[PDB]
Amino acid sequence: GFRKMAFPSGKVEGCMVQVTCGTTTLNGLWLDDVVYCPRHVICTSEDMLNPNYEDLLIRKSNHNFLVQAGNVQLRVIGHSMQNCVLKLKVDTANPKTPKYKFVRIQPGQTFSVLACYNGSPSGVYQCAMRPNFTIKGSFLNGSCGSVGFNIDYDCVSFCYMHHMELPTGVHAGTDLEGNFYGPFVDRQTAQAAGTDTTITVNVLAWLYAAVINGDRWFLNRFTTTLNDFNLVAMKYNYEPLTQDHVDILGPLSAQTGIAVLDMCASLKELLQNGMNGRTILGSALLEDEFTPFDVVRQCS
Amino acid sequence: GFRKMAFPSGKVEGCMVQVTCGTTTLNGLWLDDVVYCPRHVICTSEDMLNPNYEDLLIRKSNHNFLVQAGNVQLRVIGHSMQNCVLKLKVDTANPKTPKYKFVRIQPGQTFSVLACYNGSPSGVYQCAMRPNFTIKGSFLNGSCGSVGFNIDYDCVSFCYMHHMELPTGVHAGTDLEGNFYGPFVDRQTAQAAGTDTTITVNVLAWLYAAVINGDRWFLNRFTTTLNDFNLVAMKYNYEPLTQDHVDILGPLSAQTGIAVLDMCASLKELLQNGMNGRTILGSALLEDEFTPFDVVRQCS
Numbered sequence: 393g394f395r396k397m398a399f400p401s402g403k404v405e406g407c408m409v410q411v412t413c414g415t416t417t418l419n420g421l422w423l424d425d426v427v428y429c430p431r432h433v434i435c436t437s438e439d440m441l442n443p444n445y446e447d448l449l450i451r452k453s454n455h456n457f458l459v460q461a462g463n464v465q466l467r468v469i470g471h472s473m474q475n476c477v478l479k480l481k482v483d484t485a486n487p488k489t490p491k492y493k494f495v496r497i498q499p500g501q502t503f504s505v506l507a508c509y510n511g512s513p514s515g516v517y518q519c520a521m522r523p524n525f526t527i528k529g530s531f532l533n534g535s536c537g538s539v540g541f542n543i544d545y546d547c548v549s550f551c552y553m554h555h556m557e558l559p560t561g562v563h564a565g566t567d568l569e570g571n572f573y574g575p576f577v578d579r580q581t582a583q584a585a586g587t588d589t590t591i592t593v594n595v596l597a598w599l600y601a602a603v604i605n606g607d608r609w610f611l612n613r614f615t616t617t618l619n620d621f622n623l624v625a626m627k628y629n630y631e632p633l634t635q636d637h638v639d640i641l642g643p644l645s646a647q648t649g650i651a652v653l654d655m656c657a658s659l660k661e662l663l664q665n666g667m668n669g670r671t672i673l674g675s676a677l678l679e680d681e682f683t684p685f686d687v688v689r690q691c692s
Numbered sequence: 693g694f695r696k697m698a699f700p701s702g703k704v705e706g707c708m709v710q711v712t713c714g715t716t717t718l719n720g721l722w723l724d725d726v727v728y729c730p731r732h733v734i735c736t737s738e739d740m741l742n743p744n745y746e747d748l749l750i751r752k753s754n755h756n757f758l759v760q761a762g763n764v765q766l767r768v769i770g771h772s773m774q775n776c777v778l779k780l781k782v783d784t785a786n787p788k789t790p791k792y793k794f795v796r797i798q799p800g801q802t803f804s805v806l807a808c809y810n811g812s813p814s815g816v817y818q819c820a821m822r823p824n825f826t827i828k829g830s831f832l833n834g835s836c837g838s839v840g841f842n843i844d845y846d847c848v849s850f851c852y853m854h855h856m857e858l859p860t861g862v863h864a865g866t867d868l869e870g871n872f873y874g875p876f877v878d879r880q881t882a883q884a885a886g887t888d889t890t891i892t893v894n895v896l897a898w899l900y901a902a903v904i905n906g907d908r909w910f911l912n913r914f915t916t917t918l919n920d921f922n923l924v925a926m927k928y929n930y931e932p933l934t935q936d937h938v939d940i941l942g943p944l945s946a947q948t949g950i951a952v953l954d955m956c957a958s959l960k961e962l963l964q965n966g967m968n969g970r971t972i973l974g975s976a977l978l979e980d981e982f983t984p985f986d987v988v989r990q991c992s
């Protein structure tokens with residue numbers, strides 16, 4: 393079978409804390425003696441329309457920030473604002489700090505999200521950074537500060553912090569340095585993301601996973617060229633395929649014996665003729681939230 | 693938004709161990725001073741066709757079972773066979789045993805699976821016990837012994853241990869007492885599950901979640917009766933709806949203002965007229981892997 397898998401969230405659960413400022417409570421990430429949380433924790437419902445985060449932060453001191461690590465309070469001995477993230481220096485280093493790094497991911501890359509509320513883990517799911525720098529997640533009120541991460545061996549790769557929801561229902565956020573993904577800003581205004589396109593290289597990797605798992609009806613026999621396929625990809629709002637993407641799908645194409653351009657022609661036929669009621673790996677649509685890495689990781 | 697969420701797997705990761713017997717290695721569950729693992733760990737490739745698990749277990753002693761807790765070995769001071777599970781008594785109680793209980797779940801109930809290989813967690817995903825007592829999971833070789841669980845507050849509810857894969861690609865396993873879900877046996881023979889039906893009450897809960905999340909095109913205006921709806925449900929291989937299922941969907945029907953029989957008629961229209969290319973919560977099919985509990989948990 394083939395399923396959407398999230399990373400084990402054990403190493404991240406021990407880093408989630410509750411951060412309270414005034415009458416706003418959200419989640420923070422406790423790594424070493426630093427707590428990271430969205431800076432709009434210092435905002436009231438009034439200021440959220442057009443906040444001057446400077447002027448707002450100047451009127452706050454260390455003792456205005458309440459940090460909850462379960463039942464134990466952490467003492468805040470320093471605060472600073474880096475882009476759209478607030479960094480609270482605490483006197484106690486997190487005894488369960490895992491080996492970690494901060495990374496800024498690229499569009500199309502996937503990661504696991506640990507949805508939290510009041511510093512408590514609630515669930516985990518697998519997400520993908522859309523080409524328009526949004527994510528299609530599941531977030532309620534108070535979910536801000538929840539983190540997205542990847543796990544390589546022992547190391548945790550923090551890549552996302554949830555900040556806001558857009559009018560279309562999708563979600564926007566920053567890296568762990570406070571830099572937003574995309575052209576979004578942290579204020580209550582109608583912000584528009586671009587037209588969301590489909591991650592073509594991810595769809596191809598998913599079609600390869602279908603081949604490995606016995607689902608092989610969609611495999612036509614035509615072939616195509618990179619330029620000819622991309623001409624059709626533009627018409628269906630698909631991301632253009634590059635020779636880099638072709639080489640990335642190399643191992644999958646070598647395992648299944650199906651050339652990348654052969655799979656491109658089969659996708660072409662699926663885009664112009666549709667599913668006709670037939671599912672692929674149990675889905676009646678084309679899934680683009682599996683990277684080529686995710687496919688080989690799950691299939692091996 | 694609305695996503696398939698798994699429980700945080702932190703409390704379960706600390707219970708996974710590696711169990712080796714001869715040249716067979718699978719995962720075991722280390723709770724207190726007991727290790728639970730599938731009994732076919734004592735099988736060779738020859739015996740798996742028609743094993744006499746008794747005769748096979750009689751020829752094994754305590755020191756034939758190798759238990760790996762990461763890098764540390766656990767000393768086996770007792771072994772016993774309970775149904776299709778093997779219970780290894782070790783001298784050291786797991787210092788990270790969470791508050792836990794063993795439960796046997798019902799068809800249609802959901803749970804999180806922590807896929808493991810060689811006693812190491814690899815990923816987590818959300819599963820559902822199909823009405824034919826199989827699961828549509830993602831399992832490779834060596835994944836046996838991986839556990840399914842639910843998390844209420846602090847307590848972990850272990851409900852599934854993976855054992856085998858069926859010819860159709862679905863998976864079968866036992867509860868933590870070794871009793872298989874369904875009519876399956878642990879030997880390499882072509883075993884057939886019944887015709888898999890759709891969990892009707894779960895589809896209704898998902899349609900309610902779509903209503904809460906603004907997706908409301910499918911809502912017709914007709915109504916129906918429980919007997920009339922069930923007449924159509926049988927024709928599409930849907931599970932029959934009972935008055936118990938109606939009362940379970942009560943809170944969801946009270947939150948959305950849509951009567952259960954009204955939603956039943958809208959599902960009826962979807963079954964006979966199809967999607968017509970329109971998605972619901974981003975899916976072109978009817979998802980039945982969300983219980984009414986899962987919906988209210990995620991929507992609140």
Ligand SMILES: *C(=N)[C@H](C[C@@H]1CCNC1=O)NC(=O)[C@H](CC(C)C)NC(=O)c1ccc(-c2ccc(OC)cc2)cc1F
Pocket residue numbers: 418432435440531532533534535536555556557558559563577578579580581582583
């Ligand atoms: C974090 N706790 C919270 C998560 C949100 C809440 C609901 N679902 C989520 O994911 N994030 C916030 O409250 C944000 C605070 C700002 C200051 C960063 N704001 C928003 O999520 C937000 C922004 C904008 C809108 C919106 C929608 C439509 C529209 O049309 C006129 C105009 C503005 C909504 C919204 F929830």
Ligand SMILES: *C(=N)[C@H](C[C@@H]1CCNC1=O)NC(=O)[C@H](CC(C)C)NC(=O)c1ccc(-c2ccc(OC)cc2)cc1F
Pocket residue numbers: 718732735740831832833834835836855856857858859863877878879880881882883
């Ligand atoms: C556990 N390590 C492993 C997991 C399997 C392996 C592949 N994917 C999984 O989920 N489980 C086993 O190896 C089982 C051991 C038995 C003794 C409990 N066996 C199976 O999973 C198994 C059983 C039967 C078949 C099969 C399929 C088709 C068929 O048509 C004639 C006949 C038998 C396959 C199979 F993998």
